[PDB]
Amino acid sequence: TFQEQGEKEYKNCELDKNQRQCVEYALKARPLRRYIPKNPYQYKFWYVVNSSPFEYMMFVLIMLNTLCLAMQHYEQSKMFNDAMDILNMVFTGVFT
Amino acid sequence: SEYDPEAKGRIKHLDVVTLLRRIQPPLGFGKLCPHRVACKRLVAMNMPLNSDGTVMFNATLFALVRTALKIKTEGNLEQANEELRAVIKKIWKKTSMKLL
């Protein structure tokens, strides 16, 4: 009954439902900026920051942090607690 | 936006072919040689008569959208904008260049 209420959009003299949503987006748009840098010495690091291998490496780097964040349990051993503190420092360091 | 470090509205005509090549077949062209299809179909549609290397973004995708659905031949170009001005929302004077 709600859906039948939305059927009253009788603007289909020549266009179909597929044309209704695509046209409006095209009429209202503006390209954004890619922010490509310059000054090669500054541009040198942009390749490392913006690259598929870098984000793929950090993708599994974040995943391993989640695995570490889930291993804490009740009455964990003192060595386990010590191993967690250094692992926390390693992950927070690389993220920094 | 890939070819523009800053938008600035327009790009050069040398990148027009490379723009359409990296698009999926549902939106762009087939997997065959672009010379036989994409190069020939480029002139087929209607384009604004601007300078050699001054083409705006909204004048490129609009032809592609018009090609995807209800493609029309020559002789009734103004009918397209007539349909938009009678069904689609206010144009706000932004379809003047795209009308031709």
From Swiss-Prot, chain A:
Listed name of the protein: Voltage-dependent L-type calcium channel subunit alpha-1D
Summary of subunit composition and partner proteins: Voltage-dependent calcium channels are multisubunit complexes, consisting of alpha-1, alpha-2, beta and delta subunits in a 1:1:1:1 ratio. The channel activity is directed by the pore-forming and voltage-sensitive alpha-1 subunit. In many cases, this subunit is sufficient to generate voltage-sensitive calcium channel activity. The auxiliary subunits beta and alpha-2/delta linked by a disulfide bridge regulate the channel activity. Channel activity is further modulated, depending on the presence of specific delta subunit isoforms.
Species in which this protein is naturally found: Homo sapiens (Human)
Domain notes per entry: Each of the four internal repeats contains five hydrophobic transmembrane segments (S1, S2, S3, S5, S6) and one positively charged transmembrane segment (S4). S4 segments probably represent the voltage-sensor and are characterized by a series of positively charged amino acids at every third position.
Cellular localization per UniProt: Membrane
Taxonomic lineage of the native organism: Eukaryota, Metazoa, Chordata, Craniata, Vertebrata
Function, as annotated: Voltage-sensitive calcium channels (VSCC) mediate the entry of calcium ions into excitable cells and are also involved in a variety of calcium-dependent processes, including muscle contraction, hormone or neurotransmitter release, gene expression, cell motility, cell division and cell death. The isoform alpha-1D gives rise to L-type calcium currents. Long-lasting (L-type) calcium channels belong to the 'high-voltage activated' (HVA) group. They are blocked by dihydropyridines (DHP), phenylalkylamines, and by benzothiazepines.
Transmembrane segments: 53-71
Endpoints of the signal sequence: none
Protein family according to the UniProt entry: Belongs to the calcium channel alpha-1 subunit (TC 1.A.1.11) family. CACNA1D subfamily.
Domain of life: Eukaryota
Entry comment describing in which tissues the protein is expressed: Expressed in pancreatic islets and in brain, where it has been seen in cerebral cortex, hippocampus, basal ganglia, habenula and thalamus. Expressed in the small cell lung carcinoma cell line SCC-9. No expression in skeletal muscle.
Residue numbers on the Cytoplasmic membrane side: 1-52
Extracellular side: 72-86
Gene from which the chain derives: CACNA1D
Disease: Sinoatrial node dysfunction and deafness: A disease characterized by congenital severe to profound deafness without vestibular dysfunction, associated with episodic syncope due to intermittent pronounced bradycardia.
